[PDB]
Structure 1
Amino acid sequence: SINPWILTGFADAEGSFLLRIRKNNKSSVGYSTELGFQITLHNKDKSILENIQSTWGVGVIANSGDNAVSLKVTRFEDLKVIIDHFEKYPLITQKYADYMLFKQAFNVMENKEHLTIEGIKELVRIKAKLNWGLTDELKKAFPEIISKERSLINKNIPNFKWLAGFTSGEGCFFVNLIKSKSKLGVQVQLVFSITQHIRDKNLMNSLITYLGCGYIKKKNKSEFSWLDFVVTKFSDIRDKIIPFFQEYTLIGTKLKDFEDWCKVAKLIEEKKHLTEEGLDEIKKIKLNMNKGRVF
């Protein structure tokens, strides 16, 4: 079982809303629809999608390839459980707009309007603003649907447990080894990062006030660019970040990386990172965390 604010936070990170408008000869209006919500994680974290499936009592889980597992909810009657949860515990990222389009599509299909050509047209207008918008095929079939206008989402973090769910998705507990010509040769630096597209710059900035520490780093790769909420000062990590997530527990395999992160934190707090044996212990923990974990 999972906490409802924890789940929305995770759904802001991972999770996605789908609207399929598929050409289908056997449909009277020539199109069939499929609506729902889905999350795709590494096989690593299939436990998360089992706890969500069990808390909602809805969703089917299936492999999304060799390295990935998927939780998909499409059965139309079952999306009421999705909508009921997100109405009481709403998303706060730009995905909240994708959710509202999804809810608008729900009302279309609930009123059986998707079986009318006009209802398909409204669904194509909803799809045009949803996620990556219209397909080439749907653009060709509907050259009049042009608005890719996205509503702007701006909400505050509604709950401590929300950030714990979001950090379970976009968080990273990293142990950096700054190599130098010193006697030890390396400086151990704990880094806590939360990554997000520049779509939610104001939400990323708000973390600095919400947690009372950190700063924002802008990264880019060719046409794409994102942000990072970064904490590198150790006193903030020891007094704020670790006590925060120790009281609002994370979920998934990323939790085990946080526990090892705290193990390194106790060692540096004791100045053991200045020694040869203490620095070797930190390296053995860093090797077994994150991409080095044995499962």
Structure 2
Amino acid sequence: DNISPWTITGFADAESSFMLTVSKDSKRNTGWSVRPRFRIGLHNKDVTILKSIREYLGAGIITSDIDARIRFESLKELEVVINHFDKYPLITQKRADYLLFKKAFYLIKNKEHLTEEGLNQILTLKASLNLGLSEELKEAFPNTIPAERLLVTGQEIPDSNWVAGFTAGEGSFYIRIAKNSTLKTGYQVQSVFQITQDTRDIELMKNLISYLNCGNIRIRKTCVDLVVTNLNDIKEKIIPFFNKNHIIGVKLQDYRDWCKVVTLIDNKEHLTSEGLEKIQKIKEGMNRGRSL
């Protein structure tokens, strides 16, 4: 089965990266090598996801060593990328990065990066891209003025598949077992849906809650979480939503086991010892407890 473009975009909002490498090359006229990259790096166990992406865009190089990566570094591949994200725009702060990247791309495509002016401009672009300029690049290009970075605000959810890809990237379906003496079975069993993101896009997360009509915002001791713990919201909103909008990767399997446990909780089997052992058995093989 083929993947949705908005799923690709959501997942990219989650896990992808737009990069500019500027490295001193003595074998070049400007004395510098400038190259744009787009990349997605995952755990090996999710190679298939990358393949799916590769199948949709018809571009990208997939490798697998200590991790699995799909990369786009040549001009043509990057054209494919830019086409996709122009048709299907990111909505997190990463979009900003994309724009910078995009600008840089066109400077390199038109070869004016081989000009010192072009080089300097590209350095202003990298200055505001992700982690910005290293100390080495800072001293190599003194007092470069960081390009204006677009603050991504008022981002409406473009598509439900975007949500699917995004939680496929940052989401978490897990079962919480709490040591509670008030429970005659000895433990409280909770089904929990979660999405984690840096505070920079808290607005989006809030706008996401309204989209799912459930969830609470949690601020950590930094990061922000969309947390769904209400069983009825889970059974009536979340589960149907992700049954319609599929989760890719191993997290799909995790989500299935999660679903099974939710059904066990709905039938109040979590209130008995037998059902508790059952649920625990399912949980031990979920997420961090899964194998090859």
Q: Deviations over 1:247-283 (max 9, x none)?
A: 1111001110000010001111111111111111111
- Aligned Cα root-mean-square deviation (Å): 1.1
Q: Deviations over 1:160-215 (max 9, x none)?
A: 11000000000000100111123210010011110000010100111221111111
Q: In the alignment, what sits opposite 2:257?
A: 260
Unpaired segments ≥5 residues, structure 2: none
Q: Is the 8 Å Cα contact of residues 191 and 232 (structure 1) preserved in structure 2?
A: yes
Please give the TM-score of this superposition, normalised by the length of structure 1: 0.96
Amino acid at match of 1:271: K
Question: How far apart, in 2, do the equivalents of 1:78 and 1:115 lie?
Answer: 21
Unpaired segments ≥5 residues, structure 1: none
Any residues of structure 2 matched to 1:120-139 within 5 Å, and which?
A: 120-139=119-138
Q: Deviations over 1:70-125 (max 9, x none)?
A: 11110112211000100110000000000001110111011110111111111001
Question: How far apart, in 1, do the equivalents of 2:279 and 2:151 lie?
Answer: 44
Question: How far apart, in 1, do the equivalents of 2:24 and 2:93 lie?
Answer: 29
Q: Is the 8 Å Cα contact of residues 125 and 147 (structure 2) preserved in structure 1?
A: no
- The answer as to 2:240 corresponding to 1:239 is no
Q: In the alignment, what sits opposite 1:159?
A: 159
Q: In the alignment, what sits opposite 2:177?
A: 177
Q: CA deviation at 1:147?
A: 2.6
Amino acid at match of 1:187: Q
Amino acid at match of 1:288: G
Alignment: residue pair count: 289
Question: How far apart, in 2, do the equivalents of 1:188 and 1:149 lie?
Answer: 49
Q: Deviations over 1:132-169 (max 9, x none)?
A: 00111110011121436532002111001100000000
Q: 1:157 aligns to what SS in structure 2?
A: coil
Please give the TM-score of this superposition, normalised by the length of structure 2: 0.97
Superposition misfits of 4+ residues, deviation over 3 angstroms = none
Question: How far apart, in 1, do the equivalents of 2:83 and 2:102 lie?
Answer: 11
Q: Is the 8 Å Cα contact of residues 9 and 163 (structure 1) preserved in structure 2?
A: yes
Q: In the alignment, what sits opposite 1:187?
A: 188
Question: How far apart, in 2, do the equivalents of 1:133 and 1:265 lie?
Answer: 44
- The answer as to 2:247 corresponding to 1:250 is yes
Q: CA deviation at 1:54?
A: 1.8
Any residues of structure 2 matched to 1:272-287 within 5 Å, and which?
A: 272-287=269-284
Q: In the alignment, what sits opposite 1:288?
A: 285
Question: How far apart, in 2, do the equivalents of 1:246 and 1:275 lie?
Answer: 28
Q: In the alignment, what sits opposite 1:62?
A: 63
Q: Is the 8 Å Cα contact of residues 36 and 76 (structure 1) preserved in structure 2?
A: no
Amino acid at match of 1:183: K
Q: Is the 8 Å Cα contact of residues 177 and 189 (structure 2) preserved in structure 1?
A: yes
Identity, in percent, stands at 51
Q: Is the 8 Å Cα contact of residues 165 and 248 (structure 2) preserved in structure 1?
A: yes
